[PDB]
Amino acid sequence: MIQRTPKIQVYSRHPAENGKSNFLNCYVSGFHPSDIEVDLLKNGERIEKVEHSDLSFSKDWSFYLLYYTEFTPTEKDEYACRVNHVTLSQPKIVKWDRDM
Amino acid sequence: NYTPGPGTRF
Amino acid sequence: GSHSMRYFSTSVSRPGRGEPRFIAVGYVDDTQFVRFDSDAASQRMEPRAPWIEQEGPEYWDEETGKVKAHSQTDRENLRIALRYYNQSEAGSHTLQMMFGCDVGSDGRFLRGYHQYAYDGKDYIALKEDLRSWTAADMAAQITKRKWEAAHVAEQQRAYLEGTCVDGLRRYLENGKETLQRTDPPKTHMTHHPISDHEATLRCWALGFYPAEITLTWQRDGEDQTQDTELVETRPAGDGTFQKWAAVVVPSGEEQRYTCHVQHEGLPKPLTLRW
């Protein structure tokens, strides 16, 4: 057996321009085993139509997944991803920062 | 192209 | 440059909830092109890139055949491993496999792979010579003896230097506008004041392909690793990749620093200065 904690990044596909259509991404990488749960959040609430990539893994056998949704960033809307995995004591929330 | 058979077990 | 084709498979047992789930994906370099998921309704290999859609029905039948056979084999292998290790049937286990080939810049065979990991640790792998096996422990030693007796090495070698290479060459040609492109990184720098005393300089690489890249900060020409943050290269979702690297700088010392970028799409490394 073995366990690896996911690395988590939440970011936009293109530089954020308020009022312009974009994609919000949450990339989880370097984890093991493969069971993982990700939500994307708009103002603390679950975004519904979130898609993800097919399960793959890296040279060290650790898994990676891209979760994504179309979105329109604004000045005041708050976005985040929320991740749970066996290695985490509680879901981890990472706020989206347009500058990382 | 995927690897063909036969597969041999562990 | 060189190119690779890789198939990655994951089988996960689920005690008390039916047979293991098997997921396989195929990649050419950093571009995915097929998938199979044992839990999905279709029960077929499915296209995941535009340039693979032109393959005919005989391709889709034969590829589905091969990946289904793999799924069943690894289901059996999960049961065999449990017995080898005398592990409880109540626990979930994972078996991962990778196989594929590299070719050089004019399409000649470079390298082949065929390896397994069990619960995230190497189990058995075909050595680079494509003639012998490396086994990680006493359980894999049993497998190694079996594969030796069955001449698995020569069967896989014939695949790896033959069909694997032929397919990779065919895909590279069919998807040449996608696969044989290089997308250089669009680069820039942003500034983030921390206090009256400190600021962060973040060096960006955006819209690049393939994913392999190097970003380095220097101070006065000296390689700076102390006080640098580096994120993992991440997919944009559109076929390109992103990465950044940051340094905390004494306020007013921004001009001492240079960001350095290396990528296959760049004729020469870039040096960026604030």
Residue numbers in the entry:
A (entry chain B): 0 to 99
B (entry chain C): 1 to 10
C (entry chain A): 1 to 274
Copy out sentences from the published article reporting this entry, exactly as the authors wrote them.
Cytotoxic T lymphocytes (CTLs) are key players in the immune control of Human Immunodeficiency Virus 1 (HIV-1), as they recognize virally-derived peptide epitopes presented by HLA class I molecules on the infected cell surface. Nef codon 135 is critical to both epitopes, as it represents the N-terminal anchor for the downstream epitope Nef134-10, and the C-terminal anchor for the upstream epitope Nef126-10. Our results indicate that Nef-Y135F, selected to escape recognition of a well-described HLA-A*24:02-restricted CTL epitope in this viral protein, results in the creation of another HLA-A*24:02 epitope immediately upstream.
The presence of threonine (T) at the 8th position (Nef126-10(8T10F)), representing Nef mutation I133T, did not significantly affect epitope-HLA binding compared to the wild type isoleucine (I) (Nef126-10(8I10F)). In order to examine the impact of these mutations on epitope structure, we solved the crystal structures of HLA-A24/Nef126-10(8I10F) and HLA-A24/Nef126-10(8T10F) at 1.66 Å and 2.0 Å resolution, respectively. Superposition of the Nef126-10(8I10F) and Nef126-10(8T10F) peptide structures showed almost similar backbone atoms, with root mean square deviation of 0.307 Å, but conformational differences were found at P6 (131P) and P9 (134R) residues. In addition, the B-factors for the central portions (P5-P7) of each peptide (41.5 Å2 for the Nef126-10(8I10F) and 46.2 Å2 for Nef126-10(8T10F)) were higher than for overall peptides (24.1 Å2 for Nef126-10(8I10F) and 33.2 Å2 for Nef126-10(8T10F)). These results indicated a flexibility of the central portion and P9 residue in both peptides, accounting for the structural difference observed. The side chains of P8-Ile and P8-Thr protruded from, rather than being buried within, the antigen-binding cleft of HLA-A*24:02, suggesting the P8 residue could be involved in the contact with TCR. Therefore, different TCRs could be favored by the presence of either hydrophobic P8-I or hydrophilic P8-T at the interface of a TCR-HLA-A*24:02/Nef126-10. Nine out of 10 patients with Nef126-10(8T10F) viruses exhibited specific responses to the circulating epitope, and 7 of 10 patients retained the response specific against Nef126-10(8I10F).
